[PDB]
């Protein structure tokens, strides 16, 4: 239902091993479709999804030229932050940027985002008003003033409310074969036991997309459900996703617990046990 | 499509 388009910018200083490196990656929903790397011999935007390939030369030229200017701009922003935080120029630092538009289920705009970070800590961000910034440090407040004077957010609001939404809708209809596939998950059950009055059991999920999934070990609705060891979804590298949930049950409660499987592709909730 | 807006810190 909700459809997103995000562009991920990564700029990292590497003193002694080369000029800073800018990584630009675009994502629609959870699927990557464009990639830019300054360290590629011919720096240019590479297709990473089937539907984006049909695009003509001018689509690539524009994005490539923008990424190339962004490469040079964020290199100075890295130098700028050194003066703001009073850091050593020989240090290796990373600037990251998340931006894009969230689309409503009716095809109308839901939310717009432009968050920024320095060395993992949030630096600045655009509020849901698409007109004001949220500066974290005292250093970002200096930047906020500059962007407030240069009407930067205004220029960003046109993209987020215009160019972002049009092309997001464009990307969805051309690649709906894959973007709206909603491949549902799988279930496999095992039990790895210590056998000292104890045992471990695991509820699994395989080949699902999107990565949104819920795994819960309610013990026949027992008040306690949090003894379990959950792991993050791990890519199979087959363009498919895998996740397993573990629980250590005292020996003598084989089928008392009730796994809880939930995925968007499967409309009805699935409660499947051994 | 990428934002052409230059943000200078």
């Amino acid at each position: 239902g909700s459809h997103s388009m995000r562009y991920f910018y990564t700029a990292m200083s590497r003193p002694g091993r080369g000029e800073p490196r800018f990584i630009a990656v675009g994502y629609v929903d959870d699927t990557q479709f464009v990639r830019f790397d300054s360290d590629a011999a011919s720096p240019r935007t590479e297709p990473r999804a089937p539907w984006i390939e049909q695009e003509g030369p001018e689509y690539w030229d524009r994005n490539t030229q923008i990424f190339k200017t962004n490469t040079q701009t964020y290199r100075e922003n890295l130098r700028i932050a050194l003066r703001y935080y009073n850091q050593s120029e020989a240090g290796s630092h990373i600037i990251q940027r998340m931006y894009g538009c969230d689309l409503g289920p009716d095809g109308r705009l839901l939310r717009g985002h432009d968050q920024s970070a320095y060395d993992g800590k949030d630096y600045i961000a655009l509020n849901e008003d698409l007109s004001s910034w949220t500066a974290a440090d005292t250093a970002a407040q200096i930047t906020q003033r500059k962007w407030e004077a240069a009407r930067v957010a205004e220029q960003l609001r046109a993209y987020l409310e215009g160019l972002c939404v049009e092309w997001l809708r464009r990307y969805l209809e051309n690649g709906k074969e894959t973007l709206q596939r909603a491949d549902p998950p799988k279930t496999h059950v095992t039990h790895h036991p210590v056998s000292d009055h104890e045992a471990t059991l695991r509820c699994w999920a395989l080949g699902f997309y999107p990565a949104e999934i819920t795994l819960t070990w309610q013990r026949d609705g027992e008040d306690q459900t949090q003894d379990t060891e959950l792991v993050e979804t791990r890519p199979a590298g087959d363009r498919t996703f895998q996740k397993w949930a573990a629980v250590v049950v005292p020996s003598g409660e084989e089928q008392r617990y009730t796994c809880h499987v939930q995925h968007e592709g499967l409309p009805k909730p699935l409660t499947l046990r051994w | 499509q990428a934002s052409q807006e230059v943000k200078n810190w």
Partner: T-cell receptor, first 112, second 115 residues
């Protein structure tokens, strides 16, 4: 690669007669079209700004149009006055927004 | 007050001399540009600066050098003067690389290089 052509390159219009200045460009995903007037020694004076999304824009005696499909824009000037005589320039914004592609311009000769 | 101020307005150089063309704004414009007009060739881009410390070449950059140490000034140095560099030079500024706003130019500098 990005070429802007202003034909006709010159015009001679009687006083009080409405005239149209034409401009041609190549459609991009997003861009602006801007019209300027160069009077000798005065530099470029901004007149109107139209964008790819918009179709028309009016200010007083000046109307600007934009057709993304035909890659062309028109500048309509009403109640031609003798002081309106200058070189009028049309310009498009490059794809990355780093420059303004300028046409060679069109000279206006309003006859009193 | 506002606008782009270009200094000088007129100047005469001979071949091999050096001179800086000054362009200043206080309109908080992060983008600045340098153009030249020669008859029959239209306005041609020399150099642009999307921001301070950032600078790239344009259509005809040979023989021209620029600097953007500050956001308010974008000078143009003619390291060695040449007869081909006789032209009218225009400086333009704008808030940035977006489509929302437009360029503002200066009065112009008419430069004549003489043998």
């Amino acid at each position: 690669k990005q070429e802007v052509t202003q034909i006709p390159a010159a015009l001679s219009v009687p006083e009080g007669e409405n005239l149209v200045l034409n401009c041609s460009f190549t459609d991009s995903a997003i861009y602006n079209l801007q019209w300027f007037r160069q009077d000798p020694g005065k530099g470029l004076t901004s007149l109107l700004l139209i964008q790819s999304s918009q179709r028309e824009q009016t200010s007083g005696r000046l109307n600007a149009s934009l057709d993304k499909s035909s890659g062309r824009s028109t500048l309509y000037i009403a109640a031609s006055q003798p002081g309106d005589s200058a070189t009028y320039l049309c310009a498009q914004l490059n794809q990355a927004g780093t420059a303004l592609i300028f046409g060679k311009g069109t000279t206006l000769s309003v006859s009193s | 007050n506002a606008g782009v101020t270009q200094t000088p307005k007129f100047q005469v150089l001979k071949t091999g001399q050096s001179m800086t063309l000054q362009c200043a704004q206080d309109m908080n414009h992060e983008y600045m540009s340098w153009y030249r007009q020669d008859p029959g060739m239209g306005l041609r881009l020399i150099h642009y600066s999307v921001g301070a410390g950032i600078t790239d070449q344009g259509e005809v950059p040979n023989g021209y050098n620029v600097s953007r140490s500050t956001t308010e000034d974008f000078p143009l140095r003619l390291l060695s003067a040449a007869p081909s560099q006789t032209s009218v030079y225009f400086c333009a500024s704008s808030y940035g690389t977006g489509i929302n706003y437009g360029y503002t130019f200066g009065s112009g500098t008419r430069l004549t290089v003489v043998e």
